Design a protein around this ligand. Sequence first.
Ligand SMILES: Nc1nc(Nc2ccc(S(N)(=O)=O)cc2)sc1C(=O)c1cccc([N+](=O)[O-])c1
Length: 294
Amino acid sequence: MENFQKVEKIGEGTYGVVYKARNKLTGEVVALKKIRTEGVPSTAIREISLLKELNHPNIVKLLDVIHTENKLYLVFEFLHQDLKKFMDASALTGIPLPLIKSYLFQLLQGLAFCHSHRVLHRDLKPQNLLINTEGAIKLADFGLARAFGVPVRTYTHEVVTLWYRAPEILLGCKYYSTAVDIWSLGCIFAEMVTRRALFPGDSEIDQLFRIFRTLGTPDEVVWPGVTSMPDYKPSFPKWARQDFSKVVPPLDEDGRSLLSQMLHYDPNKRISAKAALAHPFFQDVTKPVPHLRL
Ligand SMILES: Nc1nc(Nc2ccc(S(N)(=O)=O)cc2)sc1C(=O)c1cccc([N+](=O)[O-])c1
């Protein structure tokens, strides 16, 4: 970029590439997302405007939006590490529970905020959760599928992670609800706790069946309407629900209770971000600072 000096490539998003860059003029360091194409939508460029006026301490700030040369650049505030790297770095010892709780609490605040402003993330995963030396964690790279929908992959032949995708999406639901983000966050919560992905599916069906084998194949009793969903098949195997205590050991009962509500099959029974913030699990929440190696 003529105005920006690419320090280095820091990620391959589901829409474009992300670079750490410095503003040649101001000298500020930012994250620059490059988007692919011969026109550019409108319902999207305006869905983006909404995201710019979306300011909250737990949401990565979208500084600028620049459309030029059949390219779409998104300028974001820069953070030094994502949760995927931090979990890997903490794989031997595990992230301490108070930090896990603080991170979950903050992300729920972020979600409560975007959801009350009718904004959905749609693609929450460790790679889209950024942390700093101050103990904060922020939601990054919002989906924006309401317009730009969901591309076959990311942008250039790349395996899109399905591990955090809600069951209703896998079953062909056309309209997503804020509940999809709660499910993804629940999956991440479990992963921080156990240090292993909850549902590591390698295909859409494998993803779906991994969920079924653990939470039990859903039926009309626990999920009214499930059998009438677009991709539901009566031929789905019928797995029994596994004891929840085997799921995220050795998480305490307050933690397991909160997770079970974040993982309810029925989107309408799934706990909201606002209600989750009030769960007894957060009675003793604090804000520890992580040990970050940058
Ligand atoms: N602002 C920002 N800072 C970042 N800093 C960063 C610093 C360190 C690491 S890492 N992996 O070395 O810990 C990763 C990101 S990433 C980032 C993003 O807004 C972003 C995140 C995921 C996907 C996309 N996207 O456009 O597709 C963009």
